[PDB]
Write a protein that binds this DNA or RNA. Structure first.
Lengths: 60, 55
RNA sequence: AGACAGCAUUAUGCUGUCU
RNA sequence: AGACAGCAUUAUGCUGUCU
């Protein structure tokens, strides 16, 4: 019968492939400057907050 | 820690249907183009040879 | 001619969490 | 701007096992 560590290494090989795909797709999009509405919302919240935090940093 | 075994079994059942779905799509795609791998050619020749030897 | 599987290369869309 | 994840759609090449 198949030993459990082998099951573990196969899932690990598999997880690695998924991360590689996602990385490839992420970088493709970045290069085309494509974002999803949620990616977009999310960066916009971040940039807004960076501005605000440096407005507390001028209060020094 | 706190994630049931039956969920794991299900998740893997899902992943396995999607793997089978991909073979099917890839397999059929190759059929349309009439494309065989070198090994698929050997196999089919050896089969057709065994079949013609019968008659 | 078919059934099943392994390996490898690779595209696209969206959503959610943390910072 | 990053980190991590989930769903969905989808292309290619090869190898092996059984009949």
């Amino acid at each position: 019968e198949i030993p459990l560590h082998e099951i573990i290494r196969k899932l690990e090989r598999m997880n690695q492939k998924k991360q590689a795909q996602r990385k490839r797709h992420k970088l493709n999009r970045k290069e085309r400057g494509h974002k999803s509405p949620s990616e977009q919302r999310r960066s916009e919240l971040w940039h807004a907050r960076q501005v605000e935090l440096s407005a507390i940093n001028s209060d020094n």
